[PDB]
Amino acid sequence: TLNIPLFYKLGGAPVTGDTPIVGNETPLDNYNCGVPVALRGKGVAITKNQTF
């Protein structure tokens, strides 16, 4: 199988007036998607009773 990631956008409020850039944390969003893979096929037979 094969997993593919995704990052979202950014979400909060602009830290108005006084606030640090060390006090007030954000996470960044992150997700996954996995595609499974399988075998598959098809065949055809040919005789000689139906061929001459």
Partner: protein
């Protein structure tokens, strides 16, 4: 139905660093002599832009009588009885260490940044002891 999300409705959200990981202020005022209702003293001092979380009041035995009657008030210059009103933890019969129950989550204003201890009722027989106050709060 019109109860919307708060005035907080949009942001991210605090953790490790220099924010307002909650704080204390501690004082140990020492009473001595005779104890009347003309007593006032600062134990600690608070910021301007801060919200209180809880006040812890532990004292010694200050009135050693068969019927104790000493009574304390904890507050600031605006309200003399803002945190504690008629505490009675300094009596020699009851227990100490009472947590605050009134006026917890409120922003300090200007001129209210010093916690006073005033004596509300006269002591029947004054002893020597000390009173401890710990005020928890934080900053934005």
């Amino acid at each position: 139905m019109p109860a919307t999300n708060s005035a907080q409705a949009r942001l991210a959200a605090p953790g490790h660093g220099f924010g307002g990981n909650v704080k204390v202020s501690y004082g140990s005022v020492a009473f001595t002599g005779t104890i009347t209702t003309a007593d006032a003293a600062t134990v600690c001092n608070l910021p301007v832009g801060a919200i209180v979380l809880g006040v812890t009041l532990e004292s010694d035995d200050l009135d050693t009588n068969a019927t104790p009657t000493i009574t304390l008030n904890v507050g600031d210059a605006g309200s003399a009885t803002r945190y504690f009103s008629a505490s009675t933890v300094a009596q020699a019969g009851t227990s100490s260490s009472a947590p605050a129950t009134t006026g917890l989550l409120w922003t300090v204003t200007e001129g209210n940044t010093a916690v006073r201890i005033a004596v509300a009722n006269n002591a029947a027989t004054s002893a020597d002891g000390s009173v401890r106050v710990a005020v928890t709060y934080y900053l934005p």
